Chains A and B, each alone.
Chain A
Amino acid sequence: SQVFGVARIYASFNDTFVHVTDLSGKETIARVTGGMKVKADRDESSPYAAMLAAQDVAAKCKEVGITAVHVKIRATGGTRTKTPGPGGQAALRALARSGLRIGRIEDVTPVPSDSTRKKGGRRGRRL
């Protein structure tokens, strides 16, 4: 009954991506970011920006014919934060409220097995 996509939220600090794909990931629909909905470079990571992005994405989804979506929430990962930014949960609640259906949230942040090397020096980012 339901036609499923994959939302693939990447909630970084400094930005948030919401962009839905087909079940395979090769075919993408409706990539929207927080910096497409605001004019600061300061609020690109804001929950409001993420919410508006998710709203536009859900609009395009129902324009195409997608009704449900699986969620893969992601942070920067690698050597970087590994914890998600503020605009992930907001986007999720937004595209839940908009009319889409949800199924099988997963957290897919790339985690290393003792990675190469973090940046900042051994003495840290100093401020």
Chain B
Amino acid sequence: PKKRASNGRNKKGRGHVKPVRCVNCSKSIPKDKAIKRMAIRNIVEAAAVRDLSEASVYPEYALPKTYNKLHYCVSCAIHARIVRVRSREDRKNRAPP
């Protein structure tokens, strides 16, 4: 039977959505169906920042961040301890935690 009303994705009124590639397995997946996440991370760590600030000229500086938008396929996302699996009722939950 049918599992989802969106069927897997976010294509109502388009027809075609121009695939992207998964970051891990390189699988072609439609962009609407993909999972998008955004991995924003300080460059070094929360641990080495003390050493960096101590060994840094230019005090006050910033320690800038790294930004990349991650696209995973369903299989990779389920394997990587992301959108894992949900009960029939909580599948409808569209919000984050």
B-binding residues in A (CB < 8 A):
2, 68, 73, 81-84, 89, 92-93, 96-97, 100-107, 118-126
Contacts and interface: CB of A to CB of B under 8 A. Distances in A.
Given A101-B56, A102-B57, A93 B23 contact: no
24 contacts: A73-B43, A83-B39, A83-B68, A84-B66, A89-B44, A89-B48, A92-B44, A96-B52, A96-B54, A96-B55, A101-B56, A102-B52, A103-B58, A105-B44, A105-B64, A118-B21, A120-B26, A121-B26, A122-B28, A124-B22, A124-B27, A124-B75, A125-B26, A125-B27
B34 interface: no
A96 B43 contact: no
Contact of B27 (A68, A82, A106, A120): A120
A123 B27 contact: yes
Interface residues of B, number: 29
A93 to B, nearest CB: 4
Contacts, number: 77
B57 A68 contact: yes
A103 B23 CA distance: 31
Interface in B22-78: 22-28, 39, 43-45, 48, 51-52, 54-58, 61, 63-64, 66, 68, 70, 73, 75
Given A82-B68, A101-B55, A107 B25 contact: no
